Amino acid sequence: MCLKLNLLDHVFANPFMNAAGVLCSTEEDLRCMTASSSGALVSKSCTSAPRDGNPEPRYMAFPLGSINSMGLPNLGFDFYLKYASDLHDYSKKPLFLSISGLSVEENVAMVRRLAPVAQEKGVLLELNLSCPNVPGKPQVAYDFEAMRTYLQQVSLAYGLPFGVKMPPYFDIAHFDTAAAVLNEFPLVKFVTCVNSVGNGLVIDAESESVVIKPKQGFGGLGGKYILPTALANVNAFYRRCPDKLVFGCGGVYSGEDAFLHILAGASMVQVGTALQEEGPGIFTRLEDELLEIMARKGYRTLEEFRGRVKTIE
């Protein structure tokens, strides 16, 4: 009947939102997402200063998904903070701000500034652990001690409930270690699974060329390629983090895909590639499709089936 829900001391019309980075870079983009049927919106990951990002072409899409090496192009933290503080109409839907500083100190500096705006206006923080490659060391969520430092320092600096955007893991020991790190931090109230599947490579057969310019054609994968990976991460963290929410991201094109994310454990469902390809109309279709599948199954609420994927024996 209706898909409205309450999470994190906020009310949402439905569980759908954009994925960080998609339709959320400029004021125009944020106003468009706010005008859409989505339940929420999140801003592009920001740095302290503005960034141009990588040379073009840096995003390409195909029937099975997309590849990107954007390079963190963004208008800078001051812009996103001003949007949260002065421009966003909170009567329309909640706002999440994504932060992706290139060091712990930069993240700390941004969160200290965000915190009073969070208290006054209710903007929510999504901390992005992914970043540009630094030769000689791994991405932060793949370096468990670095992750722990980031979360400790942000937790201290911010002091309020926040969430973390995670890259996918592929190994059950890794799920156990990552989840135990996250569970050390009671202020981490949601985990968003997943960011793009890192460093894929799309090749065009006719031209015999890679399709994006940066990184010799390597970039993160989204879309249909990554749905089972996304579900696996959603469920793994849903099981391991009983005191946290899980937000699902990856491979959502349909209400059925959203239903699968919710069965795995998702509270919110984020839409990246499909949104970039279809535009913000997609949210009315996703809502219609998810309510149709609920009606055919006899489900009246999301809670009835969230996390209730069945195992064999």
Add this chain to the structure above:
Amino acid sequence: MCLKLNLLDHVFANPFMNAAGVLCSTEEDLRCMTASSSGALVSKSCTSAPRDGNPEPRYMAFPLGSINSMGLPNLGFDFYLKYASDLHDYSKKPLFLSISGLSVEENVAMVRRLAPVAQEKGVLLELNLSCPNVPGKPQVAYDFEAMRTYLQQVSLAYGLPFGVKMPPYFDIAHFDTAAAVLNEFPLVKFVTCVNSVGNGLVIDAESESVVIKPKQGFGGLGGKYILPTALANVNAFYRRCPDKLVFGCGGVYSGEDAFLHILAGASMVQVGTALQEEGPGIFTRLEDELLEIMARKGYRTLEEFRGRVKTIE
């Protein structure tokens, strides 16, 4: 125009072979692979003792690929060694034997006894590193210290050229570290990229259930899902291991997919999921399709384009 290759002191009619685990567990399976049009075959990864593997269902396939948690079911090393020593007809095509011991000691035990048969009959060793070690630790090739130990021990015990089967990596740091480990070992003459994309989760919407029984539905992904991941890993190791061959595996359903692998750097091209689904007739189709692309482009041999993927600017 021809698909012939000469590598590792063997001659191959064409680059195609099965992926380890598909159509290669029983004598019947190996005879079928031998009778097919493939250029080579590999045996199922084996252990010292025979294994039943995990409970069924343990493999499922879908339009975009497959998921599996087989659990290393196999006839045991002695069976595969006898096939290599006494049964295979080396006049038809080369044989690779895949080994996947559950400890370094188990691998050492097997390769000591494989050595004299390798030397006399020319069977080629593929050591599977995308394999469990101690439960609660990551798979061997995700634990770089363990990987080094396995390679040191196997290189000393075997004493002949061999190759390794690698899981996919997702972080540039891991490409760099993994290739540097491999480059420590001059006896590693080929690198097969990639094994399954680990611990994905497929959920069936109608039944609200996972589709395989082991591991609460989690298992390794193959097929269309994984082609850009596979291409990335082939190219990454092709660039970082200039003194080694790279074999490509992942997401091959067509001659076009094979051509992309080869542009990325692949010598041999292995076929898993699509061979499981279509059967051994796939090899004739792949050969025809690849030859047609080569004829349209004016390429007469594989070397004309191997590793010749173009980057932008």
